[PDB]
Amino acid sequence: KSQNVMRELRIEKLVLNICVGESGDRLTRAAKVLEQLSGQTPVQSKARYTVRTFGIRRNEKIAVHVTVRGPKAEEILERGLKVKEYQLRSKNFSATGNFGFGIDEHIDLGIKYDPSIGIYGMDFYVVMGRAGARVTRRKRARSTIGNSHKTNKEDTIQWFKTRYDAEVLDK
């Protein structure tokens, strides 16, 4: 039966990325913003290789990102959807059923503004999955997910429209 309880869509994880193009104080302040929003210590990503045009070098600390799961992820997701006024595009959903958007100012989320911190834009990505994804992530007996149980673009789009009363454009 396609109308089974275990086929219920629900959020697996939310990943917050700030790719400040340089290293030092500004990246640290972006990390402070992320630790404020999520309540968890974020992790800084280093450039995998060197590009002179972007002013980055290999192993220079460029970006910072953090993964949130559970109720806090839901709260942050709706806090960010308010800034987007609940309106994403069709282009925004991947074939694997994940979606993302990008805010431009981190004070729109609803946290105190500090002149020392300044404003950073931010990137939001939500990873969707049904129950049983542990099969692909456990150590022993790792396997694949059946086709009906797979997450795709259409199922995620319909679930998003139903659960958030938002509009999915297509411009």
Partner: peptide, 21 residues
Amino acid sequence: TSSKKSDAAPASADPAKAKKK
């Protein structure tokens, strides 16, 4: 502190192929 991954094995400045028109 936090970062320590790069499970890859990169060469030098290797801006990867891509880099074209």
